[PDB]
Amino acid sequence: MKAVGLVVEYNPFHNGHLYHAQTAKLQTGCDTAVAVMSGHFLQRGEPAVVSKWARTKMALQSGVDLVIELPYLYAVQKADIFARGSVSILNELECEALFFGSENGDIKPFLETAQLIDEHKHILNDRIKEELKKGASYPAAAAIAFSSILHTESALDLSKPNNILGYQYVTSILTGGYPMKPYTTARINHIASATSIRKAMIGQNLEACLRFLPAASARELAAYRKSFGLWHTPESYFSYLKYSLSTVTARELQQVYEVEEGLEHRIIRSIRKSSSYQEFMELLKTKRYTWTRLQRMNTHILTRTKKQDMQKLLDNDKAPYIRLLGMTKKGQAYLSEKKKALSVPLVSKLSSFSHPALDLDVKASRIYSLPIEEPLRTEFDLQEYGHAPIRYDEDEQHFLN
């Protein structure tokens, strides 16, 4: 029994993710598609459009045989970390293959690059420090030390996000020596981006996207906004940002993960004067901050994730548990074959196991429902517990729950 690992956030799951889930089992020759998926808040930092449950349902119907949560711990993080944790989990489940889309359909410049870099790493740090002492900044001196190599005609721009994430998966693998072989391909009824789609739904358009989405995906989104009366946007949580920053002191906000020393003053000062999440952001920007890092920071503020929480939990080199979000027939059989093999707990009912990282995913799960109006919100908050793990019948369409 063979599975291919898929590092994903389906937000929503679109034609590109569909083609990638069919080609996964095609090109990696594994009978099973196992995805680790960001739960509620994601790597880009934003809230998911729809809960991890219903996105699970867009996935199980599009050819993903198994779906596990990527803990907030790994999910909302710099890609170097995000990659590590995700691949880590795909290896605990013993996925022999890994498969990603990318701006370079060629795996060879990925492998070549990483191998090349570790081949020279000493050179890299000598030239980095040789620029640094000359007064160069961190990313500059790194950009220079790195462009001292790799800059040949190869391209594979690692200025491109998928090349980044993919290089980082591959790096996590090699570094870890995982017996999981990586694969990649380029990205192109039709296909537009998850984000173009998203902003198109923000623009009061859903079926406009239907060419860009499979059936299950749209069918799912519709029932979500139907039930809870919203698509979740970063802006939707602005009040709770305001509120949350309203009660905190400087020293306490200093301790939140991804808040650099001294910036707490700027944050606290700016949130007052910002009638918009956008204004808030522009008031916050420093060149030591990407925009995604600012979003991530804002999430950590929202969920009150502390430097010591995150750093005492990031230390470990294995994954704390496996959260099972959903499974197919194939998925079920795979999880059954390898069940006893897991070196870490398999969490189905939350009741079974309690963990600080788990406590953190639940935390995010409660923060997620806040823009939901009640009674709907109180009922939403049930799903993290008394939700029996989703199951779906691959052959002719059945959910057994």
**Of 97-105, 145-153, 243-251, 385-393: span binding ligand TAT (CB under 6 A):** 97-105
The residues, ordered by sequence, that sit 6+ positions from 170 with a Cβ below 8 Å of its Cβ are 107, 110, 111, 114, 182
Query: Using the rule CB under 8 A, is 378 a contact of its own copies?
Result: yes
5-34 residues near ligand TAT, rule: CB under 6 A: 8-10, 16-17, 19-20
Residue 303 engages its own copies in binding (rule: CB under 8 A): yes
Looking at the Cβ atoms of 3 and 194, the one nearer to ligand TAT is 194
* Contact partner, 346, from its own copies, ligand TAT, none, Cβ < 5-8 Å per class: none
Residue 292 binds to ligand TAT (criterion: CB under 6 A): no
Kindly state whether residue 188 participates in binding ligand TAT, applying the rule CB under 6 A: yes
Burial of 157 (0-12, 13-18, 19+ CB in 10 A): exposed
399 contacts its own copies (rule: CB under 8 A)? no
Q: How far apart are CA 370 and CA 392, in angstroms?
A: 29
Q: Binding of its own copies at residue 381 (CB under 8 A)?
A: yes
**What distances in angstroms separate CA 258 from CA 76, 167, 168, 262, 297, one per listed residue?**
11, 24, 21, 12, 5
46 contacts: CB under 8 Å, gap ≥ 6 = 233, 234, 295
Segment interacting with ligand TAT, rule: CB under 6 A, options 94-102, 233-241, 263-271, 344-352 = 94-102
Among 78, 181, 225, 304, binds its own copies (CB under 8 A): 304
CB of 360 to its own copies, least distance (A): 11
Rounded Cα distance between 3 and 383, Å, is 28
70 CB-near residues (< 8 Å, 6+ apart): 7, 9, 36, 37, 38, 39, 82, 85, 86, 89
Residue 19: contacted member of ligand TAT, its own copies, none (CB under 5 to 8 Å, by partner type): ligand TAT
Q: How far apart are CA 307 and CA 88, in angstroms?
A: 22
* Interacting residues with its own copies (CB under 8 A): 238-240, 242-244, 246-247, 272-276, 303-304, 363, 366-367, 370, 374-375, 377-379, 381
* Interacting residues with ligand TAT (CB under 6 A): 8-10, 16-17, 19-20, 100-102, 162, 187-188, 191, 193-195
